[PDB]
């Protein structure tokens, strides 16, 4: 029964707060919260490997990929552990987020506590872009905001 939280911040107007909750080990993880300051439309949403914010979102490394798979969408079996797809921002620029994933975990080997949550400028193409950059990052573009994922009460 673990809980986690992430405060997302960047150089710009993108910011928000994302909660995680896992009532059972190896159970699904609820992920929910809100992000604001986004251009309308889809934005890539991933757990990156390192919780290193010493050089902004850049020092967070690549997508969290302990099983060395290709980048994919969260529904797929061929995906990085950190591949959480897209969030969607309305015309106000507010992406309400409410998803549930049993690939990530708040315990064990796929644990994401202490790693980085990142929201991107462009839409994640979910590994369908037909080039090798798609199978690596989904062409989500630059990192607009990030935060370290920390244990919550």
């Amino acid at each position, epitope marked *: 029964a673990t809980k986690a939280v992430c405060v997302l911040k960047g150089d710009g107007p993108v910011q928000g707060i994302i909660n995680f909750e896992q*009532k059972e080990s*190896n*159970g*699904p993880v609820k992920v929910w919260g809100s992000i604001k300051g986004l251009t309308e439309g889809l934005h890539g949403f991933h757990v990156h490997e390192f919780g290193d914010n010493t050089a902004g979102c850049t020092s967070a490394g690549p997508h969290f990929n302990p099983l060395s798979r290709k980048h994919g969408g*969260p*529904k*797929d*079996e061929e995906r990085h552990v950190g591949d959480l*797809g897209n969030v*969607t921002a309305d015309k106000d620029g507010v992406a*309400d987020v*409410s*998803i*549930e*994933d*049993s*690939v990530i975990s708040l315990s064990g080997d796929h644990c994401i506590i202490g790693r980085t949550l990142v929201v991107h400028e462009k839409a994640d193409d979910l590994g369908k872009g037909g080039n090798e950059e798609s199978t690596k990052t989904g062409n989500a573009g630059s990192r607009l905001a990030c935060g370290v994922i920390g244990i919550a009460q």
Partner: nanobody, 122 residues
Framework: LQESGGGLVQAGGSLRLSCAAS????????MGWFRQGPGKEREGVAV????????YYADSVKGRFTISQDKNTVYLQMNSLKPEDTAIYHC????????????????????WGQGTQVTVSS
């Protein structure tokens, strides 16, 4: 996704379907039942979340069908069956779900069962 139950039943009667997930890469987020009637498009019937409590029912089966969960098996108790319920019923599942999406839409599920015939006479 192994399905059991099904078959023929007279109108008004009851039938229990079940589906046990075996050997899946990760735990299921949603698991449930879709159906395809003669000549029609596959539609969602009932799904249930990993918590075993949160459910979604097509409007056409509300109050007659009840999905529940054990064994990581799900059960579909079908009561007051009508000829319009005749269909091939597929178990289905995912390991992720975006609650902005439609939980009874086929596109939100990529694990699937082989199918079960259900025929309601009269």
């Amino acid at each position: 996704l192994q399905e059991s139950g099904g078959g023929l039943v007279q109108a008004g009667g009851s039938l229990r379907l079940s589906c046990a997930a075996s050997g899946l890469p990760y735990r299921t987020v949603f698991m449930g039942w879709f159906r395809q009637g003669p000549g029609k498009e596959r539609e969602g019937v009932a799904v249930i979340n990993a918590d075993g409590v949160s459910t979604y029912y097509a409007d056409s089966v509300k109050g007659r069908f009840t999905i529940s969960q054990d064994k990581n098996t799900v059960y579909l108790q079908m009561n007051s069956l009508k000829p319009e319920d005749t269909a091939i019923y597929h178990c289905a599942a995912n390991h992720f779900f975006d609650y902005s999406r439609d939980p009874l839409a086929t596109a939100e599920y990529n694990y699937w069962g082989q199918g079960t015939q259900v025929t309601v006479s009269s």
